Design a protein around this nucleic acid. Structure first.
Ligand SMILES: [Mg+2]
Length: 44
RNA sequence: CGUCAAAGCACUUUGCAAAAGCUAACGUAUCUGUUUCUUGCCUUUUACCAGAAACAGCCGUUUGUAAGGUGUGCUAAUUUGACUGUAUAGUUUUUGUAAUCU
């Protein structure tokens, strides 16, 4: 109907294996990782 | 060419589905549009300039399959596939050095 209403980007992208899917974040331990990263930045 | 098998066959209309897997012309051809950037010309918008990225559209192509049409056939025609396919008594196999007994 209009130029900007034409079909475009018909394929929705999903997070892949290494991009941080729900499974990987659920398996991961975010608390300890956050603590190590905070300590590492403090070290500088 | 031959044997066997199943399929009517040749041309054609329409529907449905698919088309890179091992780097490669579905198309030895070739247009347009949108978004986000960087540019050109620029008094403001459309229309624009010419490069990129990500997306789409249109003109076409191929294959499979389903249902039909035309012309010829089923008192045969053609097509597709498969095949460990050929002679021959005259020494290297299939027209017998056999029987005899031990
Ligand atoms: Mg004004």
């Amino acid at each position: 109907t209009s130029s900007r209403a034409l079909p475009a980007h018909l394929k929705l992208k999903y997070r892949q294996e290494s991009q941080g899917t729900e499974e990987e974040v659920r398996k991961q331990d975010l608390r300890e990782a956050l603590l190590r990263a905070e300590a590492a930045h403090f070290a500088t």
